[PDB]
Symmetry: C4
Subunit: 402 residues, 4 copies
């Protein structure tokens, strides 16, 4: 009956019905913003529930969200813009650009600050940073003496924390493994942000603004929410037992509203669905939207390939929660996950489906076989809580009536 | 004489073959064969008798027990709910059936004193849809677990309901740790139970509303209505010397009573027109004459090999599905999938998908050739003859484009 | 000048090459070469002598012993019956030849006191069509089994018939358990026997009715008629110093007598136009000028690699077919199949299919390029020269689209 | 927006900017000539810096360059022209054509002239020569007692050296390994030139001229620079510590300006960017340019395939520097490298990218997926010094905007 770009709109209304019945009415999520587009046409756009439960404020199309690690693909594009200019090669050692990192060694044993280390088989490369194969980690991993050291030095964030500090402190810490020999989610992408600053001579907020946000028409994407846009800023909620949630970040008096001087290429950005849609749609088009190009078509193709050894999936190389069943049949390129094997993933989709998510359960994907994309925004830490991103794929794929 | 790149003179070899090899020598009672390509019916032939005792001929409208050709219908029903966000394939079954949380794996002993081991992981919905759950069937007659099924009549009996099947399965061991092997099973009856649980409808009402009414299938049901019983075929079973005996009289059949068991695994009676319309809808990507039963992409997903590491049934199956005729065939979400034509030793295309019934009913869809067959007879068991392979030889042989 | 994307000036390199490398130096008596692409004959050249002794030139209409280029014809004949539902490839041979039920595998001893072991499984029709049955050839001269073939004259002799071949094979051991290796064999003579058994026709009449008359092949037969004997080439055999000697005088040849043996493996005499029409029919998916010899799909099935796990001949073959020239080549139902071009070390396409004759006759069809060659000479054995590879180099080199 | 053949010309200007900033201004290279073409349109052609620093002569479009091992693909085509005529088969033993080579054995131990040897598994084939799998080597390898023997016999070049001498001396030397069991860069291609002469009955310079250069319109490609073209001949420079260079060959009084007796099918040719462009463009077209055909379309397809065993890459079979990380995901056919795996190469491009380079850092590639090619000329020995060929791929691939 009502069909746009080979999608049945009546079937897509199942998105709203599902989010109501499974998340909003039972009080598992505060509110959602969902956008679906196919062949450059927005076929679905729905705000549901509340951006701020305490103040009884609804989710609107223009609501601002902490996108967290959905920052990573933006940083990754920023650095590959410089690749396109001949500025570095992926197989170059990081220490060429960060000479204090030349003597990075691998964790053997001991607690910070008396950690013993072994020689790595080879130096860390830029490709290792872009693929989380460098041996770096994250404080929040809470798994090893290396991430214990990150937490004691506040490398994930803290008062006075800057990228210059992150790089200075990382120069003196051990890696989890010899670069390239495993996969571990990490501050690597914050380091990628540091390299964008080093190579461009710009601060990461200015690079992003000049080379990505202004050209794509993304006026509502920033590291610091301006005072006049704070009314639009969603609260962040965290999971509580019984599939409930509590306030985790009040938008009035948030760290995201202060210009605190850490620009996290890994998870710093606040955005909205229109801004992230324009970014995603540019990628879906081969790097161009409405006359503005943020990356070469071929460079993006390269970023979308599986960059793991021997075309393995995350579970074959990952040392954390990324080794679990939901990452079965999914690889990783230069800042995107890549679906390798649909049946193995146990989730409907296409080979080559690429995207990433945020800690607060934000998610996007681009299916290059179907010319289809989704941007999903909510604020519920952590993103491991619910499989809503998989239920949305079920509904969206189910609406294809080609 | 050519329709849709098929030679009709070559297809007449179907009737000639079934006459000479099965009907004239008294191996089968009667047959109904339909072939379609590119949405055109190119062959449709009733032969022999639906009821030998009453000397009643097979007609186009004859009703047949399709048995496990019910399974793809149940599988579509459940994946309709997948399309609505109602469950995920990698979710544990025990999320929806909480009494199943502590299912364990058979180690040793006879029912009711079977010793068990902890499974590596809980059973998933994908395990049920792929027969990798560890469930079995009474009729397997291979293990102490299927002995227990037979002693509890889980395959069918007086007062038997889906609620009973699920209650009794909660207290039985699995053949193996979920996902680690393949074994043909009551899993699909459980899938029917899940359609009821998720839809809040009884399976007969769900099927009727969401599949049979939309596709125009008025002659498909769990219970044959009294006014259609005249069209109902007898069922026959194999006898030594390639003969057969009466196994179910259509007058006084259990299929004519509304007993309480709706078997998503093998309950349905249908006819060639009804199953044709179902098959044609699948061949079209889930739509027929403006009615859609499933998304094009969801069906594509169901048609994929869902066995580990793209293995064939013989690499994972523990039973008769491990034998040479399943070489080069995988399994998705209620369909077999041809992986390797030469290895199968049977002409066809990669991606040929379908399934069969215990009484030797068979259908396939070749998505490369846009070709499908529905074959109906009533001869238990389906392992008796290789007629479905002879039919593929003839049908594939008739492609002249 | 270019026809069907081939440069004719580049194709003239064929004549120049055969002159310079074979004819002028006295390595071959004479050659007939035909090349076609997209159904157009782009090259047709007779060179040198059909009969050196009588100073008779090769003409377009010269008749040649094509030997094992008979095999694809027999293979098509048997798969015609497959298309009619007459057998399945995974059926035991002993279903049709019941005296073969107890065939065993050679362990040790000389004929007639050979000791044997139980095969893992009975021989199948697919084993016969793929030379994986365990049968062999007298001329192999490698084992006590082929010694027994030679002592019983199973490859040919006075009074020898297919009925005799089948009777004597019933009492001999196999080289290996059916399907577990590949060995060039009398299997295809047995395939001819099965065509007779299933059709109720003698093989010469089946071929004539179902292949030669429909394709317009009036110059293909087991016996050269008296009035065509003037067109019959002499056969030559290799002599040291890259020379040759008379091996078969066309006047007083066994090919001119109607003895009782119809060899589906190597009996036929043909000419380049007849074999061209056969090859072109295959290249077209089994049809030429309104006559169809096989279904498009059946042929596709025959052209697939039927060896285990898509292996090449060297991974399974026990003889000279295991050597470097068969690297990257598989085998289907009477055709070799190129699997890996670089590994073959010879220009061509994946899927290139064909076969050759012991007197160095050769044909191939490249389904990627829609290209085929028929090459006729009479020089036993076909292992002597790599002319078939030089011709592929030149023919592939002439593609300019 | 200035676009030709789906290439952004403004993005291609990044080539000049990059070569200036990274190589020319800092004194790492003397001068460069860069050409890029896509779909038979030349989209970039820029001379930069100096062909002769001492004489302060600029690089011009028509400057002549020592292309060195970019000779090899030309020799490889020359020999496969004869394959197309039925003159030999790839699986024929070399000793069929060079009977003194029948008893070549494999190095076990000892110094020249008392080297002990073992029986090879099989004789060397023509395919082994075309793929550098023969067991031959090069004097300059400086790795084994076999290459020590080459240096002591001057097989790479010397006064009075001829192909007849190379073949006579190789008949008496051991191989590095049993033919076909490994890969080692070698004089094999000089031997291929010898076989072109043997099979054609022409001297290699005359064969090339008649069967390649005249038909393609390449008037500025030769083994000897004619006196009237010597004014156009670049100086050759070699690397010096601190990313500097010294004069290695004065164009006035170069061996390349004398008609000495050695025609090196492996590295003898001088060319210019227009001539090599026309050769490369002919290959990109399936072996034809402006009505002249140098090779059959299908023969070239065959030459472009990976000819290494089991579709392995160079690092899985190579015994030298070709076993290192920059050859990861690249195979070898009949005189071309072939990209097998783009992600594994860590360098943007397409599967099937084919080409080769010269000792003085000349490079070309053809991308048959993108219908794109580059010819890069400079004179800096050795070619292992800088990763400029990879930086150029980054920039050129980044300019694809269709
Ligand atoms: Cl549509």
């Amino acid at each position: 009956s009502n069909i746009i770009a080979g999608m049945d709109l009546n079937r897509l209304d199942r998105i709203a019905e599902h989010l109501d019945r499974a998340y909003l009415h039972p009080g598992k999520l505060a509110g959602t913003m969902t956008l679906v587009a196919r062949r450059g046409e927005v076929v679905y756009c729905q705000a549901q529930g509340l951006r701020d439960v305490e103040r009884q404020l609804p989710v609107e199309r223009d609501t601002l969200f902490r996108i967290y690690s959905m920052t990573k693909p933006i940083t990754s594009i920023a650095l590959m813009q410089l690749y396109e200019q001949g500025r570095f090669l992926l197989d170059e050692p990081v220490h060429k650009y960060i000479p204090t990192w030349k003597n990075l060694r691998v964790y053997k044993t001991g607690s910070h600050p008396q950690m013993l280390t072994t020689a790595p088989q080879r130096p860390m490369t830029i490709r290792d940073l872009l693929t989380h194969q460098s041996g770096l980690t994250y404080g929040f991993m809470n798994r090893t003496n290396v991430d214990a050291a990150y937490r004691s030095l506040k490398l994930d964030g803290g008062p006075g924390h800057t990228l210059d500090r992150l790089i200075d402190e990382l120069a003196r810490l051990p890696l989890e493994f010899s670069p390239g020999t495993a996969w571990n989610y990490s501050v690597a992408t914050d380091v990628c942000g540091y390299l964008v600053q080093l190579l461009s001579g710009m601060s990461l907020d200015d690079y992003f603004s000049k080379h990505i946000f202004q050209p794509l028409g993304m006026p509502d994407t920033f590291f610091t929410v301006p005072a006049e846009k704070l009314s639009r800023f969603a609260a962040c909620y965290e999971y509580q037992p019984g599939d409930s949630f509590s306030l985790q970040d009040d938008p009035q008096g948030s760290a995201f509203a202060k210009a605190h001087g850490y620009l996290s290429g890994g998870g710093g950005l606040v955005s909205c669905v229109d801004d992230y849609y324009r970014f995603a749609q540019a990628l879906a088009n081969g790097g161009e939207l409405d006359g503005a190009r943020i990356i070469g078509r071929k460079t993006l193709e390269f970023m979308r390939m599986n960059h793991l050894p021997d075309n393995k999936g995350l579970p074959d190389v990952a040392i954390g929660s990324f080794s679990e069943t939901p990452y079965d049949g999914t690889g990783f390129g230069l800042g995107f996950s890549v679906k390798l094997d649909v049946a193995k993933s146990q989730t409907v989709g296409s080979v080559g489906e690429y995207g990433w998510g945020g800690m607060a359960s934000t998610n996007f994907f681009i299916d290059p076989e179907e010319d289809l994309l989704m941007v999903f925004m909510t604020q519920l830490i952590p993103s491991s809580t619910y499989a809503v991103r998989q239920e949305l794929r079920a509904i969206i794929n189910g609406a294809l009536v080609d």
